[PDB]
Design a protein around this ligand. Structure first.
Ligand SMILES: OC[C@H]1O[C@H](O[C@H]2[C@H](O)[C@@H](O)[C@@H](O[C@H]3[C@H](O)[C@@H](O)[C@@H](O[C@H]4[C@H](O)[C@@H](O)[C@@H](O[C@H]5[C@H](O)[C@@H](O)[C@@H](O[C@H]6[C@H](O)[C@@H](O)[C@@H](O[C@H]7[C@H](O)[C@@H](O)[C@@H](O[C@H]8[C@H](O)[C@@H](O)[C@@H](O[C@H]9[C@H](O)[C@@H](O)[C@@H](O)O[C@@H]9CO)O[C@@H]8CO)O[C@@H]7CO)O[C@@H]6CO)O[C@@H]5CO)O[C@@H]4CO)O[C@@H]3CO)O[C@@H]2CO)[C@H](O)[C@@H](O)[C@@H]1O
Ligand SMILES: OC[C@H]1O[C@H](O[C@H]2[C@H](O)[C@@H](O)[C@@H](O[C@H]3[C@H](O)[C@@H](O)[C@@H](O[C@H]4[C@H](O)[C@@H](O)[C@@H](O[C@H]5[C@H](O)[C@@H](O)[C@@H](O[C@H]6[C@H](O)[C@@H](O)[C@@H](O[C@H]7[C@H](O)[C@@H](O)[C@@H](O[C@H]8[C@H](O)[C@@H](O)[C@@H](O)O[C@@H]8CO)O[C@@H]7CO)O[C@@H]6CO)O[C@@H]5CO)O[C@@H]4CO)O[C@@H]3CO)O[C@@H]2CO)[C@H](O)[C@@H](O)[C@@H]1O
Lengths: 512, 517
């Protein structure tokens, strides 16, 4: 009532910081990059030591690339399945702790300054198989947990299809499932029954290996939670054609009557022809988008938060005739928009998505992102072309946003600086606080941390001040990517200086 | 619909910047500070030269302090009236252009490094009176404009009361209107009639002088608009007791039956103040104001719209909740918090006046209701960089904590200059500032802070002229709670707007870099 006395509590009725608005920082590091003797990083001791080091710095987020089974080139983005984990991340030493291997069975260490997948597979897979076999042949607590995992409806809704798909793909010599004999191609019940009988061992071992992955990943996730670290995963909007995701869900994709894609993914200008099948969004509507709901439920199972690559495809997507050799001959199609996210909310509750929204995007993309409250991205490596309206410049950043120095698709800051255009360089020198070129990565890190963006993420390569040899991926190249590992001599114990320097900057910019 | 082709225009359907979100910068400079021969700055040629210089820098806002008639110490915040203009800002040269003075009547120039009000009044007021007399005695276009001004209902709703109040205050030897004889104190109709008869000349001259102020100020404002410069004024939430604002609107204030205030304004002791502050202004009877749809405040805002593009309101928190001290108290601690009018006030203003552009002065420990009210009306608050380096990294004045809908200052008229502030800064705050700011020579510390203001996400950055000129503590405009030596700063006599090209270039370069052009 106007003019009357307030209660005496008035003076303590102060604004409270919303815990959901807490400023934070983190590190982008894929677990393949961890040090160790078995040819690849894994979910063992180095994952826990990394989490400890991250906690020591004051960082509270760890971002990974997709954890799916990669292709032969190591790519997390050409996954063999959208929901399975990369079994080569399984730690042999952790299997010893679980009693499925004995210490004596572990292999002699190998030099692998970079990940060679074929070498890691040859070394580790026989032992992961032996552990899985011991698991299925036993009858204890661990076997009982395997059964709970296998019979859990939110696991079984993708795992059985994944395991049958893999067993068929293992048994058949064929390019893709389009070439499979009709009863297998089209999942006839008695054909699938016959596959279970004839490939029973393969199927049970595949499922056990997914269990072992789940168990180890979940231990890592819990450990991160215990040390005040959230994990942010990565989910590409599209899935590959030759996958259980498509084969077991044909009606949910734009395929012809023979199961061949009608239209494929890409972006216009030469633009890019990615060549993935496209979702049949109208068909998906008819079962309240169950396929996407299930995918998000799996993402929730693995990660605290998730980046979706090419988030713009939910508003509008480029569709290329499947017979085309290039992208420029396609059409833009209307995406599902907020009705998809409404269905997800109804199905799964609150989600934490990060929209990858880089490049030329349309007004509908921005409106959709805002309507669901998702942050977009700023990337400082992109800030110094054009004028002062570039959205990647700090003064243009938004609070509900994730700022990066760069992503896995960019060179390291040092490498980027090396090849940078003179006009962009002179510009960067005005915006950034730069001392020696040796320390350019720390200039950019400081600019990221000084941002109003609620979350700042730095690649481990930039914290280590590494050059172009440490770049994780060069887009559109098909060899020499995804192999970077933390140098063999750099232990998390050897990074106290870097931790102190990070912590000092987080303190200064209110991210602790 | 889903899955179908978009039109072929799709790829050009790009996000458009909202023109209302445009980043900008500006300068805080009160017109008394302009150079010139008559003891005080004025609304003549220096105001136009300043606008031209400001335009050249890329700035698009000019902020002033209240333009009201100040007290004898020069304070714009102890105004004699809430709506009148300070007639000492009237340019004598502009009166010559209007044919109301001849060049020969102008006084010999005086050296006045700082504004002395008594000196300016003695020099200028007789000539402003002579001009006003010539105006009222004439017939012609200018006389016709005077009549239009006087008979305009949105002028007359405050000007007639102001003019009668001033005529009585002139005629009577009394401390305040509380001491006036009852028929004058209480505005008896036949007493007011008698005053118009006996003080007709005074009243007509007062009104003419307000006309001359309005004419000159409106020319400055129109010139600014032509050069792409918005003017931001300043309106203190409360008004003084000895004013037409109170005397002519007694039922709108918390007064007793004798017209003495029941409760007066202040703030209580704080995290940052052991004793609070007793300001001692009368308080609004907000309940009574609600009953006529806040007509007094609607009229005040209409006058603010007439003078300014946008307006800062000092102690905006008083609209949500206000501290009320028994008027007999010698100490602020004795009061209590009362419920303010909240958004119903702003709704009434919107109905009465349309869209307004207010800036909320919201500094210090404020309550959740203040923040919610400010946000509900879309008003920006303030950040002041001089306050940013105490406490930890959650300090709201630090750039990383700035908001878009906000006005960032290096400092205000109540703060020292940046150079002066730096000189006396606490070693712990200084070390902190040295980490956050980009500093070259310490002589150029004001430019470090300017850069930090411009680099902010805050939509508007405002810099005192003293900081552009890199001046020290001698150029501080006001020291709060002191009663002598304030409000006097003038631009050094040597420094002309024709010789600030380097400063203009430097500002423009920073505005370009930070997207404020
Ligand atoms: O003419 C005859 C006449 O002459 C004289 O009168 C004249 C005056 O002398 C003259 O100056 C002039 O006055 C006028 C002014 O010019 C004009 O500007 C106007 O001024 C008004 C304001 O309008 C009004 O709002 C008010 O302002 C007051 C405040 O009410 C008061 O509280 C106080 O605030 C200041 C602080 O004290 C000061 O410390 C600082 O605060 C900073 C702080 O330092 C900084 O750290 C930061 O703080 C954060 C903090 O970092 C963050 O962590 C958090 O804290 C939380 C904790 O962490 C938690 O643990 C938990 O506790 O919660 C807290 C809180 O959430 O949040 C903190 C807050 O954000 O930021 C702070 C700032 O935000 O600055 C404060 C603001 O200045 O002091 C101000 C200033 O005084 O009053 C002034 C007037 O005093 O109007 C004036 C006219 O009325 O003209 C006069 C008339 O001529 C004579 O005096 C007179 O007697 C003669 O008759
Ligand atoms: O395994 C077998 C397989 O191997 C290869 O395939 C693999 C790939 O090689 C490999 O890279 C990997 O790809 C995946 C990738 O790793 C993932 O991150 C993910 O990437 C895709 C993205 O999700 C998706 O969105 C898209 O992104 C591309 C965009 O669509 C394009 O438009 C384009 O956009 C970039 C611009 O070209 C570029 O210029 C830059 O733009 C910035 C400007 O520089 C800057 O000025 C600023 O502009 C402002 C202005 O300043 C302002 O005034 C105003 O006008 O606004 C503008 C715009 O805001 O800002 C711009 C940025 O905002 O950056 C743009 C963003 O990058 O390129 C994008 C990047 O490519 O496609 C990505 C993939 O290309 O998913 C990938 C796919 O899965 O894995 C592959 C699979 O293994 C072979 O290629 C295969 O053939 C082989 O079969």
């Amino acid at each position: 009532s106007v003019g009357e006395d307030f209660p005496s509590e008035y003076e303590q009725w102060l604004p409270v910081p919303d815990p959901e608005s807490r400023r934070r920082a983190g590190v982008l590091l894929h677990p393949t990059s961890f040090r160790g003797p078995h040819g690849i990083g894994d979910l063992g001791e180095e994952a826990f030591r990394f989490i400890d080091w991250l906690h020591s710095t004051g960082c509270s987020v760890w971002q990974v690339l997709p954890l799916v089974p990669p292709d032969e080139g190591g790519s997390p983005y050409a996954g063999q399945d959208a929901n399975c984990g990369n079994t080569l991340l399984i730690s042999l030493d952790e299997l010893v702790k679980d009693g499925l291997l004995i210490k004596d069975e572990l292999p002699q260490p190998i030099d692998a300054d970079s990940v060679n997948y074929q070498t890691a597979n040859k070394l580790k897979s026989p032992l992961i198989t032996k552990a899985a076999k011991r698991l299925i042949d036993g009858n204890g607590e661990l076997k009982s947990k395997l059964l709970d995992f296998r019979n859990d409806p939110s696991i079984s809704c993708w795992l059985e299809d994944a395991a049958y798909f893999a067993a068929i793909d293992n048994t058949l010599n064929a390019y893709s499932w389009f070439e499979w004999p009709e009863p297998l191609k089209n999942r006839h019940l008695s054909a699938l029954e016959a596959i279970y009988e004839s490939q029973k061992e393969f199927i049970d071992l595949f499922i056990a290996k997914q269990f072992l992955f789940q168990r180890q990943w979940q231990k890592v996730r819990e450990y991160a939670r215990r040390q005040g670290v959230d994990i942010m995963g990565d989910m590409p909007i599209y899935v590959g054609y030759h996958s259980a995701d498509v084969w077991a869900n044909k009606k949910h994709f734009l395929l012809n009557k023979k199961g061949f894609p009608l239209l494929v993914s890409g972006v216009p200008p030469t633009g890019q022809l990615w060549g993935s099948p496209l979702y049949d969004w109208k068909a998906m509507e008819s079962d309240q988008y169950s396929w996407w709901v299930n995918r998000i439920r799996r993402a929730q199972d693995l990660y605290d938060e998730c980046r979706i690559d090419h988030f713009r495809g939910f508003a509008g997507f480029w569709a290329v005739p499947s017979e085309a050799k290039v992208a420029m001959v396609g059409r833009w199609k209307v995406g599902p928009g907020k009705s998809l996210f409404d269905a997800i909310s109804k199905g799964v509750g609150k989600i934490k998505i990060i929209a990858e929204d880089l490049g030329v995007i349309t007004k509908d993309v921005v409106e959709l992102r805002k309507s669901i409250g998702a942050p977009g991205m700023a990337v400082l490596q992109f800030a110094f072309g054009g004028g002062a309206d570039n959205p990647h410049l700090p003064h243009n950043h938004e609070v509900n946003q994730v700022v990066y120095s760069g992503t896995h698709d960019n060179d390291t800051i040092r490498g980027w600086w090396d090849t940078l255009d003179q006009e962009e360089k002179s510009k960067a020198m005005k915006y950034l606080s730069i001392a020696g070129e040796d320390d350019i990565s720390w200039s950019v890190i400081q600019a990221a941390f000084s941002s109003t963006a609620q979350t700042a993420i730095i690649p481990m390569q930039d914290i280590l001040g590494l050059g172009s040899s440490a770049r994780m991926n060069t887009p559109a190249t098909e060899v020499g990517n995804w192999g970077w590992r933390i140098p063999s001599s750099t232990s998390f114990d050897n990074l106290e200086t870097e931790s102190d320097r990070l912590r000092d900057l987080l303190s200064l910019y209110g991210r602790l």
